């Protein structure tokens, strides 16, 4: 069975949620379902990346980093896949996976996902991970324009797995309060988490009669894309995809053009693994706690239509979009594969202020925040052969990320960007530097005030 078609290579960059969906061209598109979510904190990615920036690695730091990272990441991915999970996105500090099933089956699936989580820690019993799990209703949002598509999962189950994540320490498996209350408590031994309603999993103690293999196989009954039969030994049914122009047209909208060129063998397969000077523009769009997903979707769509238009003007791209706690965030980048223009820093700032101005006027968006940082960041395809994504990793990525969170409502920039721009000082304001989660001495942080006082 020949399986190396372009459509198959494109599908490697996408979850089954997108590959095997069949939904309208309307944007935004929204769908609703139930499932179990898994968030694997891999940090040790942004910790290690800056070790490989040193001269000890003799200009092969990027190639060495992608190698060892994929070694560990791909092992996590294999575990997720063989347990029936769907890896939704990679984000440098973690991956998010989904077990979509009917509500009546969440109880049994939570057990599958807990066993999966425990075997993932088994792979690493320095290098360790933290796992959060949640279960309940999930909303999917698809937004984009006629040639680009993006997706997000939204809902309390998403926010639940967010908070379960941040409690875990190395080797921990934290269950969301709803996950704990929907799970098979007769089989899961838990313990308190101080003044948090989540719980930590200590042991999986099944009845004397219980055989997980038989249990798991019956659970696969409910998995609408688990490989079986002649394809029992495939990690993804997506590997069996055959040419289909209409489907490929839809799927390629989700993938960055430079990635498509590699998939088409018009670019060296190692061209995208690099430690590169870029400028990160991290945009955050905060909505109110009361907002429903049906209001958030149209707002993100309207925001995105402007963001992409400005990014193309100033020659930037969207690398990642996230959402948790009513904040939708766009990881934008300037200066990656063929986009290194001489005045990158000035354009990043003006693009940021432009995005800030417009999105601040979109209804239902209560606050816009943008952090800008410039420096060496790792760029590469991270994951497994069958499931991988282009991702940027580095401390300047994390700095832009916390800038937009710790300095809401304004456009902030780092000292590199400030000094390097061909703009005068009064366009800026030096800021009170704040204690920021796992961030070194930033250097001076600045607000991009603009060309006028008003
Ligand atoms: C690797 N990764 C990180 C995130 C952001 C996130 C979501 C939930 C809890 C967290 F702690 C962090 C996502 C993600 C993917 C999709 Cl499809 N939708 C949304 N909303 N987020 N992927």
From Swiss-Prot:
Protein encoded by which gene: ADCY10
Annotated disease: Hypercalciuria absorptive 2: A common type of hypercalciuria, a condition characterized by excessive urinary calcium excretion. Absorptive hypercalciuria is due to gastrointestinal hyperabsorption of calcium and is a frequent cause of calcium oxalate nephrolithiasis.
Purpose: Catalyzes the formation of the signaling molecule cAMP. May function as sensor that mediates responses to changes in cellular bicarbonate and CO(2) levels. Has a critical role in mammalian spermatogenesis by producing the cAMP which regulates cAMP-responsive nuclear factors indispensable for sperm maturation in the epididymis. Induces capacitation, the maturational process that sperm undergo prior to fertilization. Involved in ciliary beat regulation.
Location within or outside the cell: Cell membrane; Cytoplasm, Cytoskeleton; Cytoplasm, Perinuclear region; Nucleus
Binding positions (hydrogencarbonate): 89, 153, 162, 323
UniProt modification remark: Cleavage may occur to generate the active 48 kDa form.
Binding site for Mg(2+) 1: 41, 93
Tissue and organ expression note: Detected in airway epithelial cells and testis (at protein level). Weakly expressed in multiple tissues. Expressed in brain, heart, kidney, liver, lung, pancreas, peripheral blood leukocytes, placenta, skeletal muscle, stomach, thymus, airway epithelial cells, duodenum, jejunum and ileum. Very low level of expression in bone.
Species whose genome carries this gene: Homo sapiens
Highest taxon of the lineage: Eukaryota
Domain notes: The N-terminal guanylate cyclase domains are required for enzyme activity. Fragments or isoforms containing the first 470 amino acid residues are fully active.
Binding site for ATP: 41-46, 93, 130, 392, 398-402
The protein's name: Adenylate cyclase type 10
Ranges where the Guanylate cyclase domain occurs: 36-165, 279-404
Annotated binding of Mg(2+) 2, by residue: 41-42, 93
Family named by the database record: Belongs to the adenylyl cyclase class-4/guanylyl cyclase family.
């Amino acid at each position: 069975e020949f399986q190396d078609w372009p459509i198959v290579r494109i599908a490697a960059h996408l979850p089954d949620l997108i590959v095997y969906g069949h939904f309208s061209p309307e944007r935004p598109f929204m769908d609703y379902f139930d499932g179990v979510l898994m968030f694997v904190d891999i940090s040790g990615f942004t910790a290690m990346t800056e070790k490989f920036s040193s001269a000890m690695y003799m200009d092969r730091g990027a190639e060495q980093l992608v190698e060892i990272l994929n070694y560990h990441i791909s092992a996590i991915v294999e575990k997720v896949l063989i347990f029936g999970g769907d890896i939704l996105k990679f984000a440098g500090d973690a991956l998010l996976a989904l077990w979509r099933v009917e509500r009546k089956q969440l109880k049994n699936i939570i057990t599958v996902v807990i066993k999966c989580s425990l075997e993932i820690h088994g792979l690493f019993e320095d290098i360790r991970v933290k796992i959060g799990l949640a279960a309940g209703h999930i909303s999917m949002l698809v937004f984009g324009d006629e040639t680009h598509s993006h997706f997000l999962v939204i809902g309390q189950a998403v926010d639940d797995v967010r908070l379960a994540q941040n409690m875990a320490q190395m080797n921990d498996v934290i269950l969301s309060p709803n996950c704990w209350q929907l799970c098979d408590r007769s089989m899961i031994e838990i313990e308190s988490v101080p003044d948090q309603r989540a719980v930590k999993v200590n042991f999986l103690k099944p009845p004397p009669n219980f055989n997980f293999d038989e249990f798991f196989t019956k659970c696969t009954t409910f998995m609408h894309y688990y490989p079986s039969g002649e394809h029992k030994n495939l990690l993804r049914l997506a590997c069996t995809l055959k040419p289909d122009p209409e489907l490929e047209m839809s799927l390629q909208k989700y993938v960055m053009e430079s990635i498509l060129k590699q998939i088409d063998n018009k670019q060296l397969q190692g061209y995208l693994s690099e430690l590169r000077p870029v400028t990160i523009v991290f945009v955050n769009l905060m909505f109110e706690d009361q907002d429903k997903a049906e209001e958030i979707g149209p707002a993100i769509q309207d925001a995105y239509m402007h963001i992409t238009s400005v990014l193309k003007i100033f020659q930037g791209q969207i690398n990642k979009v996230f959402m948790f706690d009513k904040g939708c965030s766009f990881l934008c980048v300037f200066g990656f594969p063929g986009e290194k223009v001489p005045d990158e820093l000035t354009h990043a700032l003006e693009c940021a202020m432009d995005i800030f101005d417009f999105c601040s006027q979109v209804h239902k968006i209560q606050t816009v925040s943008i952090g800008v940082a410039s420096g060496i960041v790792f760029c590469g395809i991270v994951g497994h052969t069958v499931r991988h994504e282009y991702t940027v990793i580095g401390q300047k990525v994390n700095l832009a990320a916390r800038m937009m969170m710790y300095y809401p409502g304004i456009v902030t920039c780092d000292s590199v960007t400030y000094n390097g721009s061909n703009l005068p000082a009064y366009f800026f304001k030096e800021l009170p530097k704040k204690v920021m989660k796992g961030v070194a001495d930033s250097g001076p942080l600045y607000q991009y005030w603009g060309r006028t006082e008003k």
